[PDB]
Amino acid sequence: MSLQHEKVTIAPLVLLSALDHYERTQTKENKRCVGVILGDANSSTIRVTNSFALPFEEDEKNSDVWFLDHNYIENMNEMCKKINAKEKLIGWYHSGPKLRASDLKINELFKKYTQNNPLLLIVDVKQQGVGLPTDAYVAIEQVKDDGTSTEKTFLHLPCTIEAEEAEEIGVEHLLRDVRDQAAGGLSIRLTNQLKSLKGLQSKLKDVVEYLDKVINKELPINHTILGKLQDVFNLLPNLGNNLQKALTVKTNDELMVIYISNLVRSIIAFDDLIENKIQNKKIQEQRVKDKQ
Amino acid sequence: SATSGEAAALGMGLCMLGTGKPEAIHDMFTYSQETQHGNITRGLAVGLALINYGRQELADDLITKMLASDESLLRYGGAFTIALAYAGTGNNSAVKRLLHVAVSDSNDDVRRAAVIALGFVLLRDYTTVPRIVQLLSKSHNAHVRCGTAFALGIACA
Amino acid sequence: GRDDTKETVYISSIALLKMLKHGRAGVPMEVMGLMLGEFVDDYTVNVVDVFAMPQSGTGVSVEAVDDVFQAKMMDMLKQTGRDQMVVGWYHSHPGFGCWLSSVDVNTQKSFEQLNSRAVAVVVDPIQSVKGKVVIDAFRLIDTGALINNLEPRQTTSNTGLLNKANIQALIHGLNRHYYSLNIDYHKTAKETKMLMNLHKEQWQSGLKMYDYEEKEESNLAATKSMVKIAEQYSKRIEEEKELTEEELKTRYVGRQDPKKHLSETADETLENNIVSVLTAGVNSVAIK
Amino acid sequence: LIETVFVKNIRMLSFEDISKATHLPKDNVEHLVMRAISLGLLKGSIDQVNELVTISWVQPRIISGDQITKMKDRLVEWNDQVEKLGKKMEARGQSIWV
Amino acid sequence: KRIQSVPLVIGQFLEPIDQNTGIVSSTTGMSYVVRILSTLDRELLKPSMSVALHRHSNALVDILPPDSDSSISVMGENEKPDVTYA
Amino acid sequence: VLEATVLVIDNSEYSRNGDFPRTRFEAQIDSVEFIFQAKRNSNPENTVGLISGAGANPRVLSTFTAEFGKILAGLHDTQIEGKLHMATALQIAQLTLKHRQNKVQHQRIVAFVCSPISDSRDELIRLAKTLKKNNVAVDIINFGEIEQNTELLDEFIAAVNNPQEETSHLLTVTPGPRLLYENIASSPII
């Protein structure tokens, strides 16, 4: 069995088709929307490239009353193969907002149509999130975290939105009103730093909230989560001694390099000022002796 | 109907000119955000601009709304609403907002409307206008140049 | 009603992205697909989304107008919404430019005898660049209205006259067989908010300092390059004393100008260094 | 050895403490830690001239209810530090965050 | 950066006449005086270069890695002759 | 008559039994054959469906179609496993009837039962009245555990019992030495 779940790449077209689907079928609250995620696979980085609508139906009732057309998948498959034979079914996506009960059950329906393990793609179609609204969930079988029967459940994968030449052109044209094309390098890197810090704070607050829930026993005790948290604490370096001295010496060297570079910049500005003053004097002389 | 809609909106704006009826405002603003026809939206925007003629402080709202609206046609109406609210007054809130719109916006139509509105606001200070718009009249974007030409035409009429 | 010049085709984000993806995937074959939209009014032609017609083994000719595929796709797209008409067709002209040919004219005639207001949008994925996607719809001239010489264009607005016809497009004949139209991509707040995600980095990458050996080799190499460039700057200043302007206007065309290299190296190394310092300090303080 | 390391904590240790807590003589503690490191229980390093056995990452143990409160409080303190640092960073450089 | 489509004609830069014009010799056979694109690294316009030209205009639009236009190739290892000084 | 129908075949462990030679599974497949052929003869426009009520939760094998090839291929690839959660199967069958390609064909359901109806009686009556409200017509062909199923089958039909609409017809034919489709040809169909 292929282990291809290390990295997931989504072209913006799949996601925008998801949004179009959701806004088209007039889905109200609690009504999830589902389609297929046509792309290419068999490599380490699973890549999603094109999607289409599916007639998924489900009543907000017993989780087994879900309905989905079987002929539609193959019927779309034939037409899409006629259009392009390089796009093969690699699973399905649902219109968020988060994992539901039937996700494991319905995934098995796509087992036969797919060749590898079917891929789940959660799409925050209504945009409550702050980071990427997409995450992958490959259904794999692993032992229970509670020391019980091995379960075939979903595993989160690192999903990155990346476009190809065909779709980058359209993405750059569409949002060519809000993206700050000037920006600046160092400024954009520092903004990325601050965004990463805020994301770290948000994840920390979420973990704190979950622990607060577990101490009140609204959730059971998972020893894997607690072990991972204890490992996180163990890996926390102590700074405030040899590491401190090494970091200090590196920072001092690095600041000296910064000093040198700033000196070079200042001298460049000096030459620019000298040349500009020379040209201004020449222009003044030109106007003076040509007027007279 | 897209052929009678523009004229109907314009006549509705002209009939209630200056009064600033609090019901026609809500009706036309709500209807502008529904009609798919492009012409009717701009007609309603211009009618709303005509509605707020003279009511300087009373038309402080509908400027935060329309100049921050999403449909690029409604900001075109916000420019003219600023033009007709602070008409012949030279109030600086309107002028500052008009300049900010005329430099920071994607739809060049709204840039032209904002510059024309700038020309309309300072009609009682026609001496100054060719000094503010002198910087406008050398912008790369041609729509701004047409707007400042119209601003000169309106101001020093 | 002799149409008007203010007619505008509204292309949604879905339609344009699918257009570009299908056009780039078939270079140089002129692939073609239908165009699902709605006729709002006489002046506006809304376009919702497109789907691709198969490219039969014809090569570089737009003649595969297979009806079974169109009928099936239209009928069983209805199962999941998209109840819209067959407003137009799009075919990619990669490399040449935006203009209709005789085969294109015949196909558009076939479409006009079914809807009479069918646009003929022509993508061009090859010569499109990030901000200037070239797109322009077309619709055939009537027929004998050239006897009246009033090709259907009533300039009741300036919104249609602003666009300027292309030079090579007129060579194939623009105002002679198909009056051009306007193109206005209309967005949505949901779509433009969240296509921003293409340039949002992973959260766990900002605080990631890279290996602390490359950050010293790079500094040492940059310093050595700075020393050499400063020496070249000294010899430049020495040589500049006895040169005439007609040479300096073309002197540094073919050789490294040892001033912009100095400024570029300084700025790049300073930016990299500042980012490194900030990352190191931020992690040393917050992580602990 | 493992329970004493996990109770007494301290990334360092001593030969005498291990000898008292394991009943082995102070000469067989070395082989005990040899077995402990080889089997993967710890990842430390011995020091015999001055008996100062150094301890690093220790084999994990199932976490009880009481340990959750201490870890939760440490999380709260860490998150508060992160929030304060983020607030200072945002306030200081608001002129370039665009 | 739209003129840089991918029909192109390889030319050879000969003489930089002005800051924005040059004398290139297109592979078609005849020399031209063309306008250089204002984005190229003008420090790379060494004489006898391998710049690219727009199809019908010949305006210089791209400079190439100067080891690309070569019809003659550096002798590698498959053609390494097998004689020795001995 | 234009009549969209779904066939709820049963593949439970009890349906594996062989009171009807060869097996209740094979007999159900042959009855599906006969029903599809009869519906085709009445009107080819009618679309038939195949939903299996066993194998854990019910799995749709094919949507509303008129071609025997795909469903028959599905019949060869449905293992006899699980129990008959007929409530969920009936709910799924009702859900399918909303998506008829021809929105004019009246809803019809024919369900095959070969196992005890160990479901909530009140929930079953609620399902029956919901099906009647949607004008959904249901027929149940009982052969097998008749002593128990017939306690709830009559209740189902008396809860549906469409007087003027498509009347529900119940069949509880005792296993007899005659062909099953011959038994179902007259009483439930016409």
Next chain:
Amino acid sequence: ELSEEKYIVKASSGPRYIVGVRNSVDRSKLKKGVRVTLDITTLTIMRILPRETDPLVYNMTSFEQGEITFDGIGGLTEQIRELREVIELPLKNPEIFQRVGIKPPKGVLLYGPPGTGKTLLAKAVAATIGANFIFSPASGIVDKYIGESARIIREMFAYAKEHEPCIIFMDEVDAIGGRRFSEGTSADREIQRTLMELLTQMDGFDNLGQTKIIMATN
């Protein structure tokens, strides 16, 4: 290969181009030398066409056959042995040529009085022995246009490398074999370029892999 979608392709017309490739062409099989097809309008690579055989080379190797065999040649039995020790022996016994250490011979310049068998021997070699024969007339290489008197020889020697073993056989080479003049005219100067091109592709900065050259004159 400038990039994955930018290639520098020559054209038979002569101009170079910067051409974008299709999506189905295997980019791996694109190195210096592979023939490709270009769409006339947009100049886009379409196919991966194999190596070329110049028509003035097929017109050379497609001679009729010849019905005379080595029996028909009389008197010539020692010289037949000498020729066969270079034409047949290296092509069918390259092991004695290894331990002994001899470098395999390349050329065999048959020569003698006019009318003794210098051509009939070549016809027998074509009929007998085997290997892809290439009969080459002397003047059947020389063309009016510049350089084509040498491009033909270059393709003649390139075809052999792809059809090993090859028994390329010139004839009446005293047309393009003359002692190069020091003050010859323009005509005798372009021929000397052909003599250089022929000369280098026997001992130049490359080794003739498995090509044998038979050479006849009076």
